[PDB]
Design a protein around this motif. Structure first.
Motif, PDB file in Angstrom:
ATOM      1  N   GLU A   1       0.790  -1.207   0.000  1.00 16.25           N
ATOM      2  CA  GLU A   1       0.000   0.000   0.000  1.00 16.25           C
ATOM      3  C   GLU A   1       0.845   1.291   0.000  1.00 16.25           C
ATOM      4  OE1 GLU A   1      -2.236  -1.284   3.143  1.00 16.25           O
ATOM      5  OE2 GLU A   1      -1.040  -0.468   4.801  1.00 16.25           O
ATOM      6  N   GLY A   2       2.136   1.193   0.373  1.00 22.17           N
ATOM      7  CA  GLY A   2       3.076   2.303   0.213  1.00 22.17           C
ATOM      8  C   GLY A   2       3.786   2.268  -1.146  1.00 22.17           C
ATOM      9  N   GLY A   3       3.285   1.455  -2.059  1.00 18.63           N
ATOM     10  CA  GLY A   3       3.716   1.443  -3.433  1.00 18.63           C
ATOM     11  C   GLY A   3       4.857   0.495  -3.792  1.00 18.63           C
ATOM     12  N   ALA A   4       5.213  -0.464  -2.957  1.00 24.71           N
ATOM     13  CA  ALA A   4       6.172  -1.493  -3.423  1.00 24.71           C
ATOM     14  C   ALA A   4       5.662  -2.157  -4.707  1.00 24.71           C
ATOM     15  CB  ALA A   4       6.381  -2.504  -2.404  1.00 24.71           C
ATOM     16  N   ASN A   5       6.554  -2.390  -5.652  1.00 25.19           N
ATOM     17  CA  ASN A   5       6.229  -3.068  -6.878  1.00 25.19           C
ATOM     18  C   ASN A   5       6.165  -4.562  -6.523  1.00 25.19           C
ATOM     19  OD1 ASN A   5       6.326  -4.241  -9.487  1.00 25.19           O
ATOM     20  ND2 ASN A   5       8.447  -3.614  -9.836  1.00 25.19           N
ATOM     21  N   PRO A   6       4.978  -5.171  -6.565  1.00 24.59           N
ATOM     22  CA  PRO A   6       4.854  -6.587  -6.204  1.00 24.59           C
ATOM     23  C   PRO A   6       5.618  -7.450  -7.200  1.00 24.59           C
ATOM     24  CG  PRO A   6       2.778  -5.774  -7.092  1.00 24.59           C
ATOM     25  CD  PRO A   6       3.717  -4.602  -7.070  1.00 24.59           C
ATOM     26  N   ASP A   7       5.925  -6.965  -8.404  1.00 23.30           N
ATOM     27  CA  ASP A   7       6.746  -7.709  -9.385  1.00 23.30           C
ATOM     28  C   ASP A   7       8.234  -7.377  -9.429  1.00 23.30           C
ATOM     29  OD1 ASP A   7       4.382  -8.992 -10.179  1.00 23.30           O
ATOM     30  OD2 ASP A   7       3.993  -7.612 -11.830  1.00 23.30           O
ATOM     31  N   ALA A   8       8.780  -6.703  -8.424  1.00 27.04           N
ATOM     32  CA  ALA A   8      10.235  -6.463  -8.421  1.00 27.04           C
ATOM     33  C   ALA A   8      10.982  -7.808  -8.453  1.00 27.04           C
ATOM     34  CB  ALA A   8      10.662  -5.666  -7.171  1.00 27.04           C
ATOM     35  N   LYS A   9      12.120  -7.816  -9.111  1.00 32.85           N
ATOM     36  CA  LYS A   9      12.906  -9.003  -9.264  1.00 32.85           C
ATOM     37  C   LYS A   9      14.275  -8.793  -8.698  1.00 32.85           C
ATOM     38  CE  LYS A   9      10.856  -8.282 -13.054  1.00 32.85           C
ATOM     39  NZ  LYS A   9       9.458  -8.809 -13.038  1.00 32.85           N
ATOM     40  N   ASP A  10      14.760  -9.839  -8.041  1.00 32.65           N
ATOM     41  CA  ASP A  10      16.079  -9.870  -7.478  1.00 32.65           C
ATOM     42  C   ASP A  10      17.071 -10.217  -8.583  1.00 32.65           C
ATOM     43  OD1 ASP A  10      16.035 -12.613  -7.931  1.00 32.65           O
ATOM     44  OD2 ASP A  10      15.956 -13.216  -5.900  1.00 32.65           O
ATOM     45  N   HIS A  11      18.308 -10.535  -8.246  1.00 28.59           N
ATOM     46  CA  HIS A  11      19.311 -10.780  -9.253  1.00 28.59           C
ATOM     47  C   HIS A  11      19.082 -12.046 -10.038  1.00 28.59           C
ATOM     48  CE1 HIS A  11      22.302  -8.053  -6.893  1.00 28.59           C
ATOM     49  NE2 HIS A  11      21.566  -7.354  -7.734  1.00 28.59           N
ATOM     50  N   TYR A  12      18.164 -12.897  -9.596  1.00 27.20           N
ATOM     51  CA  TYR A  12      17.847 -14.106 -10.346  1.00 27.20           C
ATOM     52  C   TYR A  12      16.488 -14.017 -10.975  1.00 27.20           C
ATOM     53  CZ  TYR A  12      21.472 -15.192  -7.160  1.00 27.20           C
ATOM     54  OH  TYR A  12      22.569 -15.095  -6.349  1.00 27.20           O
ATOM     55  N   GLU A  13      15.996 -12.791 -11.083  1.00 24.61           N
ATOM     56  CA  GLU A  13      14.739 -12.486 -11.722  1.00 24.61           C
ATOM     57  C   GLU A  13      13.545 -13.169 -11.010  1.00 24.61           C
ATOM     58  OE1 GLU A  13      14.548 -10.206 -14.478  1.00 24.61           O
ATOM     59  OE2 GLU A  13      16.601  -9.773 -13.753  1.00 24.61           O
ATOM     60  N   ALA A  14      13.700 -13.348  -9.712  1.00 25.43           N
ATOM     61  CA  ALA A  14      12.690 -13.961  -8.856  1.00 25.43           C
ATOM     62  C   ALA A  14      11.980 -12.865  -8.086  1.00 25.43           C
ATOM     63  CB  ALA A  14      13.345 -14.953  -7.905  1.00 25.43           C
ATOM     64  N   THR A  15      10.687 -13.042  -7.899  1.00 18.39           N
ATOM     65  CA  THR A  15       9.830 -12.099  -7.245  1.00 18.39           C
ATOM     66  C   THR A  15       9.434 -12.640  -5.896  1.00 18.39           C
ATOM     67  OG1 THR A  15       7.844 -13.194  -8.183  1.00 18.39           O
ATOM     68  CG2 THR A  15       8.766 -11.431  -9.397  1.00 18.39           C
ATOM     69  N   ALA A  16       8.784 -11.780  -5.129  1.00 20.02           N
ATOM     70  CA  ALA A  16       8.135 -12.146  -3.883  1.00 20.02           C
ATOM     71  C   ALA A  16       7.235 -13.345  -4.015  1.00 20.02           C
ATOM     72  CB  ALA A  16       7.381 -10.959  -3.321  1.00 20.02           C
ATOM     73  N   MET A  17       6.481 -13.457  -5.128  1.00 19.92           N
ATOM     74  CA  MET A  17       5.589 -14.565  -5.381  1.00 19.92           C
ATOM     75  C   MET A  17       6.347 -15.885  -5.547  1.00 19.92           C
ATOM     76  SD  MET A  17       2.273 -15.235  -5.797  1.00 19.92           S
ATOM     77  CE  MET A  17       1.496 -13.871  -6.753  1.00 19.92           C
ATOM     78  N   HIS A  18       7.486 -15.857  -6.208  1.00 19.48           N
ATOM     79  CA  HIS A  18       8.295 -17.059  -6.319  1.00 19.48           C
ATOM     80  C   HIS A  18       8.678 -17.604  -4.927  1.00 19.48           C
ATOM     81  CE1 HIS A  18       9.321 -15.659 -10.477  1.00 19.48           C
ATOM     82  NE2 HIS A  18       9.533 -16.938 -10.699  1.00 19.48           N
ATOM     83  N   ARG A  19       9.073 -16.699  -4.049  1.00 18.92           N
ATOM     84  CA  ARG A  19       9.456 -17.005  -2.656  1.00 18.92           C
ATOM     85  C   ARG A  19       8.280 -17.516  -1.840  1.00 18.92           C
ATOM     86  NH1 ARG A  19      13.344 -13.747  -4.585  1.00 18.92           N
ATOM     87  NH2 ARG A  19      15.204 -13.414  -3.286  1.00 18.92           N
ATOM     88  N   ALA A  20       7.173 -16.780  -1.845  1.00 13.87           N
ATOM     89  CA  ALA A  20       5.953 -17.243  -1.212  1.00 13.87           C
ATOM     90  C   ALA A  20       5.508 -18.598  -1.763  1.00 13.87           C
ATOM     91  CB  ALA A  20       4.823 -16.193  -1.385  1.00 13.87           C
TER      92      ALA A  20
END
Length: 223
Positions: free
Chosen positions: A124-143
């Motif tokens: 809600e403070g505007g984090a991009n839910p699709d940001a990718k780390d250095h392996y192009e993995a997102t929060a959703m991949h981790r969850a």
């Protein structure tokens, strides 16, 4: 005793009064960096000393400085589960999409440590839910991999994509299927995750699935 600087140690160990008087004696101590490029704020965040953080923030300390590993105070607070500190830091302009030397945002840490309340604050403070780390993995991949079902629901609510491929070409659905997260994989598929995307070994999520899961998902999308 965690730092070579006394102010850091005071901040770490919660000694607000000794910290205030130290700063009254020499104001520069508020933002003096230690061996790790951490200041009092970083260490107050790590330990969960909310009132020390609000004191430092109302002093006017910078809130977005990163230590020698790239962690900002938002990273440290999000990852240690400090709900109230995350909230204060967001309110003072903490940057929600900052990335550390490992490539992670605070949302990455929140998703993989199951910090639901913090995940919502960042989103809600505007984090991009699709940001990718250095392996192009997102929060959703981790969850997805850890089977964090509530976190998947939060990420989906804030419109996180289900079909982003990491560097091995895996989506969060491949990861759910490989790690045998049955309900998470069913949820993903119910919210539009593709059963057709091939990873780098040319396997779809169904070819990654163990047991009967593959067949159950196939029926969900077609017949």
């Amino acid at each position: 005793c965690v730092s070579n600087l006394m102010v850091c140690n005071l901040a770490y160990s919660g000694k607000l009064e000794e910290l205030k008087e130290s700063i009254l004696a020499d104001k520069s101590l508020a933002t003096r960096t230690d061996q790790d490029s951490r200041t009092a704020l970083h260490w107050a965040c790590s330990a969960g000393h909310t009132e020390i953080v609000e004191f430092l923030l109302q002093l006017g300390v910078p809130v977005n400085d990163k230590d020698d590993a790239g962690w900002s105070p938002l990273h440290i607070a999000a990852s240690a589960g400090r709900d109230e500190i995350v909230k204060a830091l967001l309110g003072k302009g903490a940057q929600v999409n900052a990335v550390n030397q490992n490539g992670c945002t605070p949302l990455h840490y929140a998703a993989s440590k199951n910090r639901h309340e913090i995940a919502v604050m960042l989103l809600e403070g505007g984090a991009n839910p699709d940001a990718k780390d250095h392996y192009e993995a997102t929060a959703m991949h981790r969850a997805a991999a850890k089977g964090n079902l509530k976190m998947i629901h939060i990420l989906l609510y804030y419109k996180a994509s289900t079909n982003i491929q990491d560097t091995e070409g895996n989506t969060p659905l491949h990861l759910a299927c490989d790690e045998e997260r049955v309900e998470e994989a069913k949820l993903l598929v119910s919210q539009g995750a593709s059963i057709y995307i091939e990873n780098k070994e040319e396997k779809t999520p169904l070819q990654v699935a163990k047991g009967g899961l593959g067949l159950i998902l196939k029926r969900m999308v077609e017949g």
